Amino acid sequence: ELLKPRTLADLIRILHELFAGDEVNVEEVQAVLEAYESNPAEWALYAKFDQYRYTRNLVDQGNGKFNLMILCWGEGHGSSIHDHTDSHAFLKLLQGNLKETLFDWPDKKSNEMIKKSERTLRENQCAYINDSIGLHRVENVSHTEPAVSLHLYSPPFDTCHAFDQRTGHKNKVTMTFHSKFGIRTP
Ligand SMILES: [Cl-]
Ligand SMILES: [Fe+3]
Incomplete structure (x- = not known):
């Protein structure tokens, strides 16, 4: 039974329930993520920015079955075009806006990757992607708002691929945590 998360801690508790089993009800998980109303005081601990690129800040390690982390995007910071390593990926905005650009999986032939669509993800909205849907880039295109x-x-x-927009060629990238549980992890 899906109730509105009252706080981030409540959301985490609810997520532990929703991932208690071996499969994932994507629509339920997305709904509860969306229903949590971002409260900046609850996540300030995790919101550790870097001047030069976006940071990944681990919040909860889940139950063997999921990670939960907070990404902090300075003005103009963005990601590669990337996949999600045969995993479910949910992205909820806690502050500001992000542009999500969708791409199809490239053919073996070297070719420009042409965007299939783009959208602006706004505060409190929750998006979902997986490899069956396609690839994406996520960017903070704002000049003034992190x-x-x-x-x-x-x-x-903790690994995925980055795709060269010019060719479709991919390279494996190891993903690192800027912090874990509020502690900077150099
Ligand atoms: Cl993502
Ligand atoms: Fe992604």
């Missing part, structure tokens, strides 16, 4: 997003991945993964 963005903060809440990401849930299931199963957890």
Whole structure:
């Protein structure tokens, strides 16, 4: 039974219930993520920015079945075009806006990757992606407002691929945590 998360801590408790089993009800998880009303005091601990690129800040390690982290995007910071390593990926805005651009999986032939669509993800909205849907880039295109997003991945993964927009060629990238549980992890 899906109730509105009252706080971030309540959301985490609810997520532990929703991932108690071996499968994932994507629509339920997205709904509860969306229903949490971002409260900046509850996540300030995790919102550790870097001047030069976006940061990944682990919030909860889940139950063997998911990670939950907060990404902090300075003005103009963005990601690669990337996949999600056969995992579910949910992205909820906690502050600001992000542009999500969708791409199809490239063919083996070297070719420009042409965007299939784009949208602006706004505060409190929750998006979802997986490899069956396609690839995406996420960017804070604002010149004046940092963005903060809440990401849930299931199963957890710490590698993925970045895709060269010019060719479709991919390279494996190892993903690192800027902090874990509020502690900077150099
Ligand atoms: Cl993402
Ligand atoms: Fe992603």
